[PDB]
Amino acid sequence: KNIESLFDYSAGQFEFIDHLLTMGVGVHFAALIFFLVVSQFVAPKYRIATALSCIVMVSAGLILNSQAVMWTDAYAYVDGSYQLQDLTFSNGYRYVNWMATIPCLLLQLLIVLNLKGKELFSTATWLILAAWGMIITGYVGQLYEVDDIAQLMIWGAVSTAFFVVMNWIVGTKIFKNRATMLGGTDSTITKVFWLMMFAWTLYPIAYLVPAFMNNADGVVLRQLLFTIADISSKVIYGLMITYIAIQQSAAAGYVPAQQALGRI
Ligand SMILES: *C/C=C(C)/C=C/C=C(C)/C=C/C1=C(C)CCCC1(C)C
Ligand SMILES: [Br-]
Ligand SMILES: [Br-]
Numbered sequence: 001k002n003i004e005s006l007f008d009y010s011a012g013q014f015e016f017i018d019h020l021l022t023m024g025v026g027v028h029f030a031a032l033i034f035f036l037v038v039s040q041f042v043a044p045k046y047r048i049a050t051a052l053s054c055i056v057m058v059s060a061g062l063i064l065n066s067q068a069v070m071w072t073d074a075y076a077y078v079d080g081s082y083q084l085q086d087l088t089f090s091n092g093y094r095y096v097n098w099m100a101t102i103p104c105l106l107l108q109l110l111i112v113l114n115l116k117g118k119e120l121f122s123t124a125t126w127l128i129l130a131a132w133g134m135i136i137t138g139y140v141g142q143l144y145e146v147d148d149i150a151q152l153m154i155w156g157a158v159s160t161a162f163f164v165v166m167n168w169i170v171g172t173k174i175f176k177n178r179a180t181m182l183g184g185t186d187s188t189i190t191k192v193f194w195l196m197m198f199a200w201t202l203y204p205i206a207y208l209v210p211a212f213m214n215n216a217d218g219v220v221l222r223q224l225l226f227t228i229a230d231i232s233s234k235v236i237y238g239l240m241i242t243y244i245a246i247q248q249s250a251a252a253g254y255v256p257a258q259q260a261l262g263r264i
Pocket of ligand 1: 098102137230
């Protein structure tokens with residue numbers, strides 16, 4: 001069903017993928033420790049945004065770990081190359097994980113935007129439906145990446161419509177609420193929008209790899225793109241959300257935030 005299953009891999013290709021996925025685990029778990037220790041400097045109003053970064057680190061780090069183990073289970077070194085054994089490797093589990101991690105990424109943004117009550121709950125609801133629509137339709141599409149490329153493209157067009165609408169809700173909420181933001185974070189949150197547009201677009205590029213690069217090297221490329229994108233969309237994004245949360249905390253008078261920032 002997935003293109004990974006069609007090829008044998010050289011030692012270099014096989015090991016590089018293994019290292020990519022392992023480094024990703026280490027990066028997410030290292031970040032998790034940082035987000036954990038820094039959360040005591042966040043005011044109550046934003047503390048959940050930093051907690052959600054911890055939740056995303058574990059979720060993504062578990063999926064990467066699980067992908068790495070599945071990669072080594074599925075392939076063994078036989079007659080000069082890594083060849084498929086009885087177990088199967090696939091990217092489908094990443095899509096299932098997005099069902100949880102994308103809502104979390106969107107909720108931390110809504111929190112640092114100072115949204116609350118009814119606006120918060122309704123914005124989050126529409127965002128979560130649009131995200132699930134994107135992820136489900138892309139999940140279905142990738143089932144056809146070996147059997148029916150045309151079907152992969154069409155499901156990907158549907159998925160892209162949900163993506164574009166989700167980004168429009170995000171941009172609309174960022175550009176409208178920029179002005180409520182304290183401590184100069186009105187400037188930083190704009191960079192957050194651009195980081196998301198960039199980093200999230202890596203995923204659909206990766207989804208199209210079976211169409212424009214259907215071979216072992218394309219398999220490597222796809223893993224590399226997911227790694228750059230996971231890091232950018234989860235770790236780098238989380239660092240910027242945390243910075244915005246602490247800065248707004250300090251500007252609103254939360255003393256542990258002022259002292260943390262004071263001592264660096
Ligand atoms: C941390 C994981 C993140 C931020 C994953 C984001 C995933 C997407 C933006 C997926 C987008 C897709 C399309 C827009 C079309 C092709 C199918 C998808 C689901 C890869
Ligand atoms: Br507060
Ligand atoms: Br994830």
